[PDB]
Design an enzyme around this catalytic site. Sequence first.
Site, mmCIF file in Angstrom:
data_model
loop_
_atom_site.group_PDB
_atom_site.id
_atom_site.type_symbol
_atom_site.label_atom_id
_atom_site.label_comp_id
_atom_site.label_asym_id
_atom_site.label_seq_id
_atom_site.Cartn_x
_atom_site.Cartn_y
_atom_site.Cartn_z
ATOM 1 C CE1 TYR A 42 -4.034 1.635 -0.353
ATOM 2 C CE2 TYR A 42 -3.920 2.230 1.958
ATOM 3 C CZ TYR A 42 -4.554 2.317 0.732
ATOM 4 O OH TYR A 42 -5.686 3.071 0.604
ATOM 5 N NE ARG A 51 -7.006 13.231 -2.165
ATOM 6 C CZ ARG A 51 -7.236 12.083 -1.525
ATOM 7 N NH1 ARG A 51 -6.417 11.051 -1.651
ATOM 8 N NH2 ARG A 51 -8.296 11.979 -0.741
ATOM 9 C CD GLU A 87 -8.835 4.759 0.622
ATOM 10 O OE1 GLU A 87 -9.991 4.586 1.054
ATOM 11 O OE2 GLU A 87 -7.897 5.192 1.320
ATOM 12 C CG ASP A 88 -5.840 7.285 -2.907
ATOM 13 O OD1 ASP A 88 -6.179 7.475 -1.721
ATOM 14 O OD2 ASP A 88 -4.700 6.918 -3.251
ATOM 15 C CE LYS A 105 -8.848 1.989 2.809
ATOM 16 N NZ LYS A 105 -7.577 2.742 2.929
ATOM 17 C CG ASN A 114 -0.959 11.638 4.933
ATOM 18 O OD1 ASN A 114 -1.266 10.530 4.496
ATOM 19 N ND2 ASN A 114 -0.967 11.917 6.227
ATOM 20 C CG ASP A 160 -9.654 4.663 5.284
ATOM 21 O OD1 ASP A 160 -10.680 4.264 5.867
ATOM 22 O OD2 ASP A 160 -8.650 3.956 5.073
ATOM 23 C CG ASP A 161 -8.476 10.278 2.267
ATOM 24 O OD1 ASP A 161 -8.947 9.168 1.934
ATOM 25 O OD2 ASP A 161 -7.375 10.716 1.873
HETATM 26 N N1 NAD Z 1 -3.643 11.932 8.962
HETATM 27 C C1 NAD Z 1 -3.593 11.193 7.852
HETATM 28 O O1 NAD Z 1 -3.120 10.067 7.880
HETATM 29 C C2 NAD Z 1 -4.118 11.737 6.545
HETATM 30 C C3 NAD Z 1 -4.704 10.881 5.619
HETATM 31 C C4 NAD Z 1 -5.178 11.402 4.420
HETATM 32 C C5 NAD Z 1 -5.062 12.767 4.161
HETATM 33 N N2 NAD Z 1 -4.488 13.591 5.062
HETATM 34 C C6 NAD Z 1 -4.348 15.045 4.819
HETATM 35 O O2 NAD Z 1 -5.599 15.737 4.908
HETATM 36 C C7 NAD Z 1 -5.498 16.970 4.184
HETATM 37 C C8 NAD Z 1 -6.851 17.402 3.619
HETATM 38 O O3 NAD Z 1 -6.792 18.755 3.150
HETATM 39 P P1 NAD Z 1 -6.579 19.131 1.592
HETATM 40 O O4 NAD Z 1 -5.098 19.301 1.346
HETATM 41 O O5 NAD Z 1 -7.357 18.160 0.735
HETATM 42 O O6 NAD Z 1 -7.260 20.588 1.435
HETATM 43 P P2 NAD Z 1 -8.815 20.909 1.745
HETATM 44 O O7 NAD Z 1 -9.323 21.839 0.667
HETATM 45 O O8 NAD Z 1 -9.555 19.624 2.039
HETATM 46 O O9 NAD Z 1 -8.741 21.758 3.112
HETATM 47 C C9 NAD Z 1 -7.590 22.542 3.420
HETATM 48 C C10 NAD Z 1 -7.983 23.757 4.246
HETATM 49 O O10 NAD Z 1 -6.806 24.515 4.544
HETATM 50 C C11 NAD Z 1 -6.975 25.873 4.124
HETATM 51 N N3 NAD Z 1 -5.706 26.467 3.627
HETATM 52 C C12 NAD Z 1 -5.121 26.286 2.422
HETATM 53 N N4 NAD Z 1 -3.972 27.004 2.333
HETATM 54 C C13 NAD Z 1 -3.807 27.660 3.496
HETATM 55 C C14 NAD Z 1 -2.808 28.594 4.072
HETATM 56 N N5 NAD Z 1 -1.722 28.975 3.359
HETATM 57 N N6 NAD Z 1 -3.018 29.046 5.332
HETATM 58 C C15 NAD Z 1 -4.094 28.678 6.060
HETATM 59 N N7 NAD Z 1 -5.035 27.835 5.593
HETATM 60 C C16 NAD Z 1 -4.952 27.304 4.344
HETATM 61 C C17 NAD Z 1 -8.074 25.849 3.069
HETATM 62 O O11 NAD Z 1 -8.802 27.078 3.024
HETATM 63 C C18 NAD Z 1 -8.935 24.675 3.490
HETATM 64 O O12 NAD Z 1 -10.005 25.094 4.344
HETATM 65 C C19 NAD Z 1 -4.454 16.737 3.099
HETATM 66 O O13 NAD Z 1 -3.512 17.815 3.068
HETATM 67 C C20 NAD Z 1 -3.778 15.423 3.450
HETATM 68 O O14 NAD Z 1 -2.358 15.578 3.495
HETATM 69 C C21 NAD Z 1 -4.025 13.097 6.230
#
Ligand code: NAD
Lengths: 551, 551, 543
Positions: free
Chosen positions: C90, C143, C233-234, C161, C399, C256-257
């Site tokens: 994965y 994505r 997923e993705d 997965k 991530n 999951d996300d």
């Molecule tokens: N914990 C984990 O294991 C796990 C798993 C999957 C995904 N993720 C993470 O979850 C995140 C989901 O968010 P996304 O990237 O899809 O964007 P998103 O559009 O879902 O949300 C991002 C938010 O951050 C804000 N933002 C963007 N740039 C900014 C800045 N410079 N300053 C302040 N705020 C800002 C946006 O307005 C928005 O509200 C991903 O970045 C991914 O890396 C984590």
Amino acid sequence: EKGKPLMLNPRTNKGMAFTLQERQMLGLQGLLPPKIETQDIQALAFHRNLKKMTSPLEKYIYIMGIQERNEKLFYRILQDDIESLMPIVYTPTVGLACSQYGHIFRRPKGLFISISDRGHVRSIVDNWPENHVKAVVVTDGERILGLGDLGVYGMGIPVGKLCLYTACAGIRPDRCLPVCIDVGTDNIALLKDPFYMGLYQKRDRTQQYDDLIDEFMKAITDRYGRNTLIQFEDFGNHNAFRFLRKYREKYCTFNDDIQGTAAVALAGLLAAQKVISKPISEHKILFLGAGEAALGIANLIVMSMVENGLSEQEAQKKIWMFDKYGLLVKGRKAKIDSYQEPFTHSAPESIPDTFEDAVNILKPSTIIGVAGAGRLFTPDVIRAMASINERPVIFALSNPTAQAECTAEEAYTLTEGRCLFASGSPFGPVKLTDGRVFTPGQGNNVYIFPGVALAVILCNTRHISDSVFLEAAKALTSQLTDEELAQGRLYPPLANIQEVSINIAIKVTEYLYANKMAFRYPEPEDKAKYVKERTWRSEYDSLLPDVYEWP
Amino acid sequence: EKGKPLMLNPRTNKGMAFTLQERQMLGLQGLLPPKIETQDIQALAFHRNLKKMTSPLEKYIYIMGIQERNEKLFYRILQDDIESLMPIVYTPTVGLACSQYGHIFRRPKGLFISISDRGHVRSIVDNWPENHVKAVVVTDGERILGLGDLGVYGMGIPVGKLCLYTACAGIRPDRCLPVCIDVGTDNIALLKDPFYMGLYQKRDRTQQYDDLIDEFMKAITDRYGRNTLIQFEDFGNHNAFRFLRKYREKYCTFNDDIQGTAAVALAGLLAAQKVISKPISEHKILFLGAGEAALGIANLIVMSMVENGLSEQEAQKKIWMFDKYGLLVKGRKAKIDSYQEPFTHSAPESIPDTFEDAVNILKPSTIIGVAGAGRLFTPDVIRAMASINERPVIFALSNPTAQAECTAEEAYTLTEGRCLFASGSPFGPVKLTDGRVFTPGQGNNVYIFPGVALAVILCNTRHISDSVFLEAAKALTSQLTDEELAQGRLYPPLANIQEVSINIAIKVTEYLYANKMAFRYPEPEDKAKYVKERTWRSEYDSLLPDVYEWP
Amino acid sequence: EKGKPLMLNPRTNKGMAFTLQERQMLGLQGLLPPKIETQDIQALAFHRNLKKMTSPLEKYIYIMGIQERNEKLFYRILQDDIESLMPIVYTPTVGLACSQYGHIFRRPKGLFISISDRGHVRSIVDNWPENHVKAVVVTDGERILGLGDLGVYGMGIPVGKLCLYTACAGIRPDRCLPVCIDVGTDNIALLKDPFYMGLYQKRDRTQQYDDLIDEFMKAITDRYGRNTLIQFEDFGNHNAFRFLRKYREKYCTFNDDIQGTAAVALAGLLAAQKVISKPISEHKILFLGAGEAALGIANLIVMSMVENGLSEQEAQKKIWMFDKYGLLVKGRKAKIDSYQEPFTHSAPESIPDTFEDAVNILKPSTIIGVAGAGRLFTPDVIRAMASINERPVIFALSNPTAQAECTAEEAYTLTEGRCLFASGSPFGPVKLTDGRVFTPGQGNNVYIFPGVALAVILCNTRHISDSVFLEAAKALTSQLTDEELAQGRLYPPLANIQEVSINIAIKVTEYLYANKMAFRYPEPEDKAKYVKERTWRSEYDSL
Ligand SMILES: NC(=O)c1ccc[n+]([C@@H]2O[C@H](COP(=O)([O-])OP(=O)(O)OC[C@H]3O[C@@H](n4cnc5c(N)ncnc54)[C@H](O)[C@@H]3O)[C@@H](O)[C@H]2O)c1
Ligand SMILES: NC(=O)c1ccc[n+]([C@@H]2O[C@H](COP(=O)([O-])OP(=O)(O)OC[C@H]3O[C@@H](n4cnc5c(N)ncnc54)[C@H](O)[C@@H]3O)[C@@H](O)[C@H]2O)c1
Ligand SMILES: NC(=O)c1ccc[n+]([C@@H]2O[C@H](COP(=O)([O-])OP(=O)(O)OC[C@H]3O[C@@H](n4cnc5c(N)ncnc54)[C@H](O)[C@@H]3O)[C@@H](O)[C@H]2O)c1
Ligand SMILES: NC(=O)c1ccc[n+]([C@@H]2O[C@H](COP(=O)([O-])OP(=O)(O)OC[C@H]3O[C@@H](n4cnc5c(N)ncnc54)[C@H](O)[C@@H]3O)[C@@H](O)[C@H]2O)c1
Ligand SMILES: NC(=O)c1ccc[n+]([C@@H]2O[C@H](COP(=O)([O-])OP(=O)(O)OC[C@H]3O[C@@H](n4cnc5c(N)ncnc54)[C@H](O)[C@@H]3O)[C@@H](O)[C@H]2O)c1
Ligand SMILES: NC(=O)c1ccc[n+]([C@@H]2O[C@H](COP(=O)([O-])OP(=O)(O)OC[C@H]3O[C@@H](n4cnc5c(N)ncnc54)[C@H](O)[C@@H]3O)[C@@H](O)[C@H]2O)c1
């Protein structure tokens, strides 16, 4: 799967109703004659040919031949003429066929478990191809109705009943398993026939018998589940009745001779209570017979009265029983079982020597015949009831017509057309000398077993309560129209057995869910939509691959 | 048969070349990505990916992966680039792969017969799924070329050769059976590896060995027929040569190291006779080696001369042999076998101690090296030939390049570009100091085994005569163009092996029929049309059902 | 069933481990070499062969080859070396490999549904050979975390997965269906490639797209039942999150996300509470981001706070959000969704234009970064948290390591080893000048998705509540021992993912039965025995 296999499998074979496109795509083109038919023109052909045959046995061989070759067409022609062909596929024809047609065709059907397979019954059960059996019907072949011991040829009765499971309630054939337990035969006609298909021994009546049926129950249950419905058919009555009492709580099982009879009997009595609006105070029931049949019918009468406001002890007091040793009365030379005690009461003024006597002293509104003797409802007993009661209720339920307590003719004539009569025996209409003709009550267990079976399976029910048969009885009589009730119909038309069986099934489904006897969840909001959508239908499915242009 | 099974079977799998209609009608829609390709765009993809790989072993794993998943695509990409991929699929890469890639993939292929299965070899042969095997190629794994004892990993060599049976002659893969006989291994690298897939014993060299190969011959013959073609591959030379002599008359078998070498050798000598128009009187042949290789080549030279007007006794007199114990001469301390006698002659004036001596006294037009020693064709022997002969014919046929009697460079330079040289070893072009470049003769057994195999199978031939290899040799050289002959080509271009293999097959077919060695009747009028129409082709067949409107 | 078909079927093929008795009985004598082995010997051989493979890509190809030939051996190998091989099968190597494996091998697996197959999805679902699918994972390939739009080659992620579904929680592989919906690709390199295996069209974003998903939902549900667990997923973050809202009440669905990320985040937050034991009134959580990720994490935090005495609105008041247009405050110029409204609060006297200024005014106990905008947990932001809080909680959850809000190095160094730091990135241990060594928390959705899945499937659950993920988060932190918490761990060791996954499954099984969302009856008295005796195992069965 494609090619010849689709035609040699009756569950997939559409025969001439195979579409040209289906034939071409599935490799059937050339293996069938060059004509496309419909199930409509198929069914018409087999009906025309069936109505050139006058013999019920010839009809049996022709229709059972269609079952082995085309499943969906077999159940279409069966449902198109259900009242006419129910007596061919099942009783009375099935018993006469088995005895005669087993030795000519020698076609194996269902699962055979011999006493010689003791210890390894699971291994034999495991050899059955279908992995999701819901309904098991088993025979030992000892008491085939109107014939006797037919040994392995008994197999035909479980097959014939499972046909009506599907035809009447829409239970899936692949989820059905006919079983024949072979412990020997006491019929020397079979034991001396070199071409007999069974075990050449007298019936094993030792502990090995009881232990084999024990092993068979565990085996079926261990493969298919604890909820798997099991019915013992045309077993010896002592065996059939003692096995209901042994397995009723542990396993999902019901018996037609006790519980089906009780439901069908109560249904007729409730139908009689709609024409005769006699208050429950004026009701007094006298039984000829005090066995498992009487006990079962009496139980359902008591439970009906307790729902209608009476007390269990009051309801029981309105029920009297008269066995071989006369009336069942507290303090009697003859034995009274713990089961017969509730309907055993303090003696009246005179002790009756005969049943005619008992009627005159007790003055019952209803007499029920469940003693396998003969015409014990003698002209004198029938006349005494007509004197005591305006509209006497006379139920001669001993099924082999010979063993029936009275005929329809001797019932209606000696009561000058005032009696409400029912029987298990097929008496035709009886014409009085004033000119009016009476069509008698005919209690058939086909009214109950399909609906009860569908409900229990659909609800994943593991225990069948007495109340299921009470709810079944009310459900049956609830379907009699005010016009039919005024014409003296005690039972719905058999031509409508499908609508009847499904409406009983919906009403038992509702009961099982409301009383925590259902294990299928989530619970449906509309139990009518639940049942009617899960019924198997005779309509041919399309086996044509989905070919389309990519846009 | 429809659905996933068509994709998991490499003999039916078309992969992405499955038509949309095929996918939809055969139940493949959704099991393949949503794109329809052709064999053309498929083959192009696998070529592009194969030419990003520089390692021959990486190429072997990639192309053998396609064989296991898509048979027709494997043989399409193989035939599209046959000269480049023949050395990958077979020698030299196959030996290097087996030794290294067997322990990493552990993928079973072909039929394995162990000495532990002695008595029941037929039962193991019966477990092979294909019922019409025509061609059997078997190894014991003892003498894999350039590696040695690889035990059960030897299986790869029979697999690789049968690939070229199909690629070069169009022999059907389903009619081909690769076999590996496991009698142990003498390689302690395998005997001490816990993950070795073979028998943990030293090679059985007792009567049980000879009796197992006897049982295997009978077993194959008893299932598939007396006409079933059997080739022993990368067996010990003593075993390989003594088994040809034991089974040649009883069974349909031929050996590449003796009979393929003889045919390829004669082909080159006949090609040399077209540039050098030397009369057969002026011809004198001297061999380094007097074993089964020399005897086989000498036999085919004698038979060529007898067809061209000379006598068997005259032809033999033009052939001299020099073994470990010097020249073979009537009255010599060292032993001369009954087989070596025809080429053993009355001593000349001087007895030669060395091979250089023998050349100067006998003054041969041609020298042939078939002694597995090393550079015995020493600079002095090569120079002596250039002095005695205008255009000396020098054939260094000892195959492991180390064991070859001379290099192409030391042949052409020390003969100042006048020598007609051939070898089994892959020597590149050799440039002289005057500037002219010489591309040397390269005798490969792939010229003979495909054509001979196809003819014998197509003709239902049960015996392979010496004349088959004579007719094969003439057929090979008959295909060299007058332009190619003037450029000093002794062998046709390997890129044209298909046309070459089929033209040999037609010419051997003609011979077998004319000399009553064919059992397939009726005899065809046009043996060219017979062969070319019975060849298996890499083109995908349509698996689409025939759907049409009824007029 | 007999002979070669048995060996060519990965579900049945035991390879060299086929016993002599079996080979004699199933017509395999001769089709197999003489050697007879144990799964033990096979496993050791393939472990040694894989240690010689250098690239994670080369490893992926080798192990995924075993999966297509010997399924039970593949899951033994994977479970034997689960921590090292989970990143191979994965994330992260599955996304990298998806490109090359497709063009080179062109080997087909899973179920492919096209926008071209609209109206005919049931035909495709009915063509899948398995009749008892309990777990479906679907992608469109828009994505792929790290690589973005990989089109039809995105199929690799569902396949990856489902391998962990089985490896971690013992979900039967034959009841697992990987699906790839092809609606076209916006990736121009793939559209140009003559050997692309998908539709040569751009991603259809019309009503036809949304209708295909509805048809896929219905088709799967019509064949396998409404119980059938479906996981997107993705997917594109837009579609993925709007499909959860649409289908979560109608079908058995979880993302999951959002819900997995929320559960692993809360679990770490709960693990940090066991160490510092901050009074719940003093808790102030500031999110960098107001996306559906932040909303999911926040929702579960209020649900934890409500379970511990707080009212819903007083729990929401303890959670602040800061996005691209600054802090979410009532009457801000920038747009606020209805889902962002609960965490949109009355403006403080000073309105922060900077996240450092947000930290200084609000004085948060916890900062959670979920923005995907890079290193916005700046040294001055980290220093401020260390100044305001004795034991500050810093969660940089974005991530792809390069888009993470801060590093473990930056966190522990500028906090003088006082911070409780978790990330989704693979940061190594940090050694400070005082000689103390800090091992950062690494949140992985693999802690949640296996256990939750097994529980829902075994209980025949049709709707997955938010409370399932709160109970999963609690179950994960319960795995953490006192020595591990003392050693500053926020997540259980990944080496014990199997035990962790089954223990989580048992606790979710208990909740579903207690809250009447389990439709499997009879109800088990021992919920631990029920789960543990229904786990598929890598041990060969007697054929
Ligand atoms: N914990 C984990 O294991 C796990 C798993 C999957 C995904 N993720 C993470 O979850 C995140 C989901 O968010 P996304 O990237 O899809 O964007 P998103 O559009 O879902 O949300 C991002 C938010 O951050 C804000 N933002 C963007 N740039 C900014 C800045 N410079 N300053 C302040 N705020 C800002 C946006 O307005 C928005 O509200 C991903 O970045 C991914 O890396 C984590
Ligand atoms: N038709 C098949 O080949 C097949 C076989 C197994 C499972 N399934 C699928 O798996 C799912 C699980 O089924 P379920 O438990 O929801 O069934 P259900 O809840 O609709 O039915 C309740 C019980 O009654 C039985 N039943 C239903 N209709 C029947 C009939 N006409 N005759 C006899 N018995 C009947 C069922 O086997 C079940 O045990 C279903 O969605 C079904 O489509 C299909
Ligand atoms: N032919 C068959 O296949 C067959 C066999 C047995 C029962 N049956 C039917 O099933 C029903 C149940 O019978 P059972 O198996 O309980 O029989 P059983 O003998 O166990 O009980 C029948 C009852 O009738 C009573 N009885 C018998 N002869 C009598 C007489 N001359 N006067 C008054 N009472 C008398 C007995 O005392 C007993 O209480 C009967 O109605 C019978 O018609 C049919
Ligand atoms: N293709 C099949 O599935 C199949 C199998 C058996 C028989 N048949 C049919 O039965 C008939 C009998 O065949 P026949 O004896 O006339 O064959 P034939 O006379 O065309 O061939 C002569 C022999 O050579 C073999 N042969 C032919 N082409 C070959 C190839 N490309 N590679 C290897 N061996 C090859 C044959 O098996 C046969 O033994 C044929 O008409 C054929 O269509 C077909
Ligand atoms: N490496 C291998 O796999 C391998 C093994 C055996 C043979 N071969 C090849 O096959 C061919 C057949 O060889 P064989 O199996 O008959 O070997 P062999 O020993 O049976 O016969 C070879 C002949 O060469 C002669 N010879 C050996 N050393 C000599 C020397 N120093 N001077 C003169 N004569 C000498 C021998 O007397 C003998 O007559 C050879 O050309 C050899 O290159 C290859
Ligand atoms: N109690 C035991 O010792 C035991 C052990 C193993 C299997 N079983 C089986 O349980 C059956 C009971 O009926 P049931 O199937 O309705 O109840 P169940 O508890 O077996 O099934 C629960 C649900 O989860 C699914 N499921 C079960 N195990 C799974 C796994 N490892 N991976 C993915 N999905 C899984 C099933 O398909 C079902 O929909 C029996 O027929 C028996 O064969 C019992």
